[PDB]
Enzyme design. Structure first.
Site, PDB file in Angstrom:
ATOM      1  N   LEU A  57      71.504 106.263  23.389  1.00 15.09           N
ATOM      2  CA  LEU A  57      72.014 106.269  22.020  1.00 15.09           C
ATOM      3  C   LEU A  57      70.954 105.638  21.129  1.00 15.09           C
ATOM      4  O   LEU A  57      70.655 104.449  21.271  1.00 15.09           O
ATOM      5  CB  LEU A  57      73.338 105.516  21.922  1.00 15.09           C
ATOM      6  CG  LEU A  57      74.018 105.503  20.553  1.00 15.09           C
ATOM      7  CD1 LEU A  57      74.331 106.919  20.095  1.00 15.09           C
ATOM      8  CD2 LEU A  57      75.280 104.656  20.590  1.00 15.09           C
ATOM      9  N   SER A  58      70.390 106.429  20.214  1.00 12.38           N
ATOM     10  CA  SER A  58      69.294 105.943  19.384  1.00 12.38           C
ATOM     11  C   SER A  58      69.741 104.899  18.367  1.00 12.38           C
ATOM     12  O   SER A  58      68.899 104.146  17.864  1.00 12.38           O
ATOM     13  CB  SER A  58      68.618 107.113  18.669  1.00 12.38           C
ATOM     14  OG  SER A  58      69.534 107.813  17.847  1.00 12.38           O
ATOM     15  N   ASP A  59      71.035 104.836  18.045  1.00 13.67           N
ATOM     16  CA  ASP A  59      71.506 103.880  17.047  1.00 13.67           C
ATOM     17  C   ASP A  59      71.401 102.445  17.555  1.00 13.67           C
ATOM     18  O   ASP A  59      70.872 101.568  16.862  1.00 13.67           O
ATOM     19  CB  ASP A  59      72.944 104.206  16.647  1.00 13.67           C
ATOM     20  CG  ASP A  59      73.069 105.557  15.973  1.00 13.67           C
ATOM     21  OD1 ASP A  59      72.865 106.583  16.654  1.00 13.67           O
ATOM     22  OD2 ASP A  59      73.369 105.594  14.761  1.00 13.67           O
ATOM     23  N   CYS A  60      71.898 102.188  18.765  1.00 10.21           N
ATOM     24  CA  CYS A  60      71.859 100.835  19.313  1.00 10.21           C
ATOM     25  C   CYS A  60      70.448 100.415  19.704  1.00 10.21           C
ATOM     26  O   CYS A  60      70.104  99.232  19.586  1.00 10.21           O
ATOM     27  CB  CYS A  60      72.793 100.730  20.519  1.00 10.21           C
ATOM     28  SG  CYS A  60      72.411 101.880  21.859  1.00 10.21           S
ATOM     29  N   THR A  61      69.631 101.359  20.173  1.00  8.54           N
ATOM     30  CA  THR A  61      68.267 101.030  20.577  1.00  8.54           C
ATOM     31  C   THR A  61      67.450 100.520  19.397  1.00  8.54           C
ATOM     32  O   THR A  61      66.628  99.611  19.551  1.00  8.54           O
ATOM     33  CB  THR A  61      67.592 102.253  21.197  1.00  8.54           C
ATOM     34  OG1 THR A  61      67.652 103.349  20.276  1.00  8.54           O
ATOM     35  CG2 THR A  61      68.283 102.651  22.492  1.00  8.54           C
TER      36      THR A  61
END
Ligand code: BOG
Ligand code: BOG
Lengths: 255, 255
Positions: free
Chosen positions: A231-235
């Site tokens: 998930l690119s949002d949390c990364t």
């Protein structure tokens, strides 16, 4: 299937298997005494082919298109008269076997904590109707109490975990705020080690590539490391937290 | 249709029209109160697709073949899902129009005394459902009392007339028997003139040829001249009667 969204693909596949098997649960004495009060007409004395397209004006946000309705109407007469009384044995059996093996390969890589309460609940029925006496069913039953939650009101159900996202936001807020008493150092370290341990580094078990999935290498999830979902949002927030904590002294926050 | 028997062709054609139109009579209060006692199960709470092939062991003389049953089963799913919700307008309308015009052309040539009580009764419904207010329906209604009959028991229904066949047999018996008193001459003449008048000589009205019918020229019927149907059985006896009466003196039997 390598084109549609992951959530839809993992949700409708058990629905596809259930529709293909035409499975109906046992009719308990409660079912027969409760099915009459619900419908405004007699239970078995109504029609169903022309009742398929009746959309309420209160729960309608995205109405169906003409092409979509035509496709569904054509498929209703294309499939039901064919694959119900004279079902293609080879095609249907191969489809069911492929669905079963895909579900089994997906749940093993997901550690039986698959995305969504509804998806997990449907997958539990999908694996139970295939083998009521097995180990996958028992392990699915074992992770059920991982979603129930209690609040000021009665018991509720938590759709998914969010500890990592909120922990990262709180850590970012704490480090952005000035360290007045400077006693938040132990808590910052006790959260930073957990954040470091929360990184997903291992690839999904089996041939994750070429199986309608994307490559994961040093990625982060939204709920916990036990899921293994990129998930690119949390990364992006995790990287900012790590970079901001990097410039902090080693002697105060640790390694 | 130019291959099957005439009786089957003239009987199943109204059946074909009725099946195509899916006509159902009005449900009177008697129908609803009588439909429950007949069936051993509830009227609307039963199945019908798998109930089509249930043959009794008492009224079974010629069992269905495997190929025939397979053809019917295939046609059930070939036609019902197609020509009921998405019916071919052109094909179905042309078929119905051709059936109607064939029935109309057949009944006019038959003088509304068509073969069979069941066929005439079904044709009456077939022409009534098309136009309840017409003249063909009234003329069909007018010839209804031509079939009822009374005997030692109550009133019965006569399937078809047989006056010509029995008259020919009686005339042959009388002429074969020796004329002892010779007073049977007037009766022989009064029957011979009727036999002469009973000969069908006119062709069917319209283009009888190339309309799935055979040419009739100086033929005899089984019931009466008002029908106009060729039958080699009665003609053979009529010719024998005429030849045997030919050698009789003119002065005793007439012209
Ligand atoms: C090579 C063709 C074999 C026959 C295919 C029939 C159409 C597919 O249909 C299926 O076939 C099964 C096997 O014959 C049968 O049980 C039924 O006809 C039907 O379920
Ligand atoms: C040239 C094709 C015109 C549309 C006909 C589709 C096949 C004919 O079949 C019939 O046609 C009706 C009229 O369209 C439709 O309701 C359905 O397709 C069916 O009832």
């Amino acid at each position: 299937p390598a084109k549609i969204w992951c959530y839809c693909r993992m949700v409708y596949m058990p629905m596809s298997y259930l529709y293909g098997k035409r499975f109906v649960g046992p009719i308990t004495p409660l079912i027969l005494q409760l099915r009459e009060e619900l419908h405004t007409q007699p239970f078995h004395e109504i029609q169903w082919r022309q009742t398929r397209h009746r959309c309420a004006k209160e729960d309608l946000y995205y109405p169906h298109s003409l092409i979509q309705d035509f496709i569904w109407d054509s498929l209703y007469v294309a499939s039901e008269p064919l694959l119900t009384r004279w079902p293609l044995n080879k095609i249907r059996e191969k489809a069911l076997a492929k669905a079963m093996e895909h579900i089994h390969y997906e749940d093993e890589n997901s550690r039986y904590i698959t995305i969504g309460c509804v998806e997990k609940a449907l997958c539990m029925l999908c694996c139970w109707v295939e083998d009521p006496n097995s180990d996958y069913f028992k392990k699915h039953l074992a992770r059920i109490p991982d979603y129930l939650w209690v609040a000021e009101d009665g018991m509720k159900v938590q759709s998914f975990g969010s500890q990592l996202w909120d922990a990262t936001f709180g850590f970012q807020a704490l480090v952005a705020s000035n360290l007045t008493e400077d006693e938040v150092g132990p808590a910052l370290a006790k959260a930073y080690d957990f954040i470091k341990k929360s990184q997903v580094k291992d690839n999904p078990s089996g041939d994750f590539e070429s199986m309608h999935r994307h490559i994961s290498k040093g990625s982060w999830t939204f709920s916990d490391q036990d899921h293994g979902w990129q998930l690119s949002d949390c990364t992006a927030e995790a990287l900012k937290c790590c970079l901001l904590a990097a410039t902090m002294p080693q002697e105060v926050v640790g390694e």
